[PDB]
Amino acid sequence: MLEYPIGTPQNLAGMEIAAVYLQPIDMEPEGHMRKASESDIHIEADIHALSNNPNGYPEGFWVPFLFIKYEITKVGGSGAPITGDMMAMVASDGPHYGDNVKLQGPGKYKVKYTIYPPNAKENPMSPYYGRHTDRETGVRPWFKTFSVEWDFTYAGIGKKGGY
Amino acid sequence: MLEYPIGTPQNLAGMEIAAVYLQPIDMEPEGHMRKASESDIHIEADIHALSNNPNGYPEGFWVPFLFIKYEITKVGGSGAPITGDMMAMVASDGPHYGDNVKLQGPGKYKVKYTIYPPNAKENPMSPYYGRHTDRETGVRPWFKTFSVEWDFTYAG
Ligand code: NA
Ligand code: NA
Ligand code: NA
Ligand code: NA
Ligand code: NA
């Protein structure tokens, strides 16, 4: 299969944060993603643990229970920024955070993700996850909410809504 | 600290399901686990993907967003079954499903886990996790809720 990069990955708080996209997808439960026919891409946040991750994840593990908001802005565009809240889901290549998105035509875009840890009050998955704190099996505190940004160009006859 | 085994792992639906226990733990957020001072063990369900997992997980990945109920019963003895729901959490050896439990003294116990997929009506994480279904990136349907059982000898 093929996917497309948004910039290059960034390493922060013991994690690799990468932005990628592919064609719009379909998901179970149905009717939660924007319809694939009304979208240009499926945008994703690919988040995996680095070596010696402070929260106990082995290197390469997917980091679960995060909440990710995104803002996509067209450089020099007359449109309002594109925003949304990703959802965690599994595909044939494993779990991701993603969302189906409709863009504003070909051009340069700024992409900003805001990543919330699993103890943030803004993260609706926080009631479902814990962290050991005892001496023998405990880990370091969760990272604080942070953002990451990339620039990328979306353009071409082979790009849906990019020509 | 020792991680004690509860039987041997069992393989179903493209996953390894293993049971272990250790001493009671402390967790953030506080007030969800039974106090460590009022518990005997921390029981865990260790669930990881096997090769060719049908739901898209690479081999060895933790299987996330499941919901696990347990029933622990002192074998052929006085006492009611001990029941509860585990919680997903991370520790220094990675993520698990687990719970602090008070037992009924040394002896043999049956341990049964009932494992609910992300789309089960009993799984509270159903509004928060999806599965791709399109032809190019989709995976097979979720497994149906099932149980696995073992026994172990608690020494203290
Ligand atoms: Na909480
Ligand atoms: Na066994
Ligand atoms: Na088996
Ligand atoms: Na706490
Ligand atoms: Na045993």
Side-chain angles (χ1 to χ4, degrees):
Chain A
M1 306 191 283
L2 296 175
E3 312 81 35
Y4 309 92
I6 289 168
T8 59
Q10 295 177 53
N11 293 346
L12 297 151
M15 302 176 285
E16 176 188 270
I17 316 299
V20 297
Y21 74 88
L22 62 150
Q23 71 273 11
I25 59 89
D26 298 332
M27 191 192 76
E28 174 200 5
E30 195 52 87
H32 295 260
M33 287 289 102
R34 185 180 180 102
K35 286 179 184 172
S37 63
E38 295 178 359
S39 302
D40 291 327
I41 62 169
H42 185 72
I43 197 169
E44 292 174 321
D46 282 340
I47 303 176
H48 297 86
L50 297 173
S51 59
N52 309 306
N53 168 276
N55 304 127
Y57 294 108
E59 186 177 11
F61 259 31
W62 181 58
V63 181
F65 296 91
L66 304 187
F67 175 64
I68 301 162
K69 294 183 175 187
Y70 63 89
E71 184 170 9
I72 299 165
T73 308
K74 193 178 193 185
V75 176
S78 55
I82 295 141
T83 63
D85 294 350
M86 299 195 187
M87 191 177 317
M89 61 186 85
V90 72
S92 63
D93 63 342
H96 307 270
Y97 297 98
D99 206 25
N100 279 354
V101 168
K102 177 70 192 172
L103 299 174
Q104 289 166 350
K108 293 191 201 297
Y109 284 89
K110 186 173 85 184
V111 174
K112 185 175 93 181
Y113 294 169
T114 303
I115 301 169
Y116 294 76
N119 67 343
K121 70 191 188 185
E122 304 83 1
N123 177 349
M125 281 162 280
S126 297
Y128 301 110
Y129 200 53
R131 175 184 69 90
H132 290 210
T133 63
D134 50 284
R135 184 179 65 90
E136 292 245 42
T137 71
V139 300
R140 301 280 194 171
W142 290 117
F143 61 90
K144 299 289 186 180
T145 301
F146 67 97
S147 301
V148 285
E149 324 173 1
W150 301 261
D151 294 335
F152 85 109
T153 299
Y154 186 76
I157 198 164
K159 303 293 179 184
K160 188 173 188 198
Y163 81 106
Chain B
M1 181 191 285
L2 291 174
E3 179 186 278
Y4 289 92
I6 292 167
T8 301
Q10 296 180 33
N11 291 344
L12 277 180
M15 302 174 288
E16 176 187 278
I17 307 104
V20 300
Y21 64 97
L22 55 151
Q23 288 182 224
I25 61 92
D26 297 332
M27 193 193 75
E28 173 196 5
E30 280 286 8
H32 294 257
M33 289 294 100
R34 185 180 178 101
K35 287 181 183 174
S37 62
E38 296 177 0
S39 302
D40 294 322
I41 64 168
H42 184 74
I43 197 166
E44 295 176 325
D46 287 336
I47 302 174
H48 296 85
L50 298 173
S51 58
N52 309 306
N53 167 277
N55 305 127
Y57 294 107
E59 185 178 13
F61 259 31
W62 181 56
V63 181
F65 291 88
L66 302 187
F67 176 70
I68 317 299
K69 295 188 179 281
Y70 62 88
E71 181 162 344
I72 300 164
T73 310
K74 199 158 196 196
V75 176
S78 182
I82 299 160
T83 63
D85 295 343
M86 297 196 185
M87 189 166 167
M89 62 188 81
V90 75
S92 61
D93 62 339
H96 307 269
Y97 299 98
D99 203 26
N100 279 354
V101 182
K102 178 69 192 173
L103 297 175
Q104 294 162 355
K108 293 194 202 300
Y109 289 84
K110 300 309 294 205
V111 174
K112 187 176 90 188
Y113 294 168
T114 303
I115 300 159
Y116 294 79
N119 69 341
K121 69 184 180 189
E122 304 86 356
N123 185 335
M125 284 159 281
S126 66
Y128 301 110
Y129 197 57
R131 173 185 71 89
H132 289 211
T133 63
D134 49 285
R135 184 186 186 96
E136 287 186 329
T137 73
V139 300
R140 301 279 195 171
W142 290 118
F143 62 91
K144 298 288 188 173
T145 300
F146 66 98
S147 295
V148 286
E149 191 159 10
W150 304 263
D151 46 66
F152 78 107
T153 300
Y154 180 58

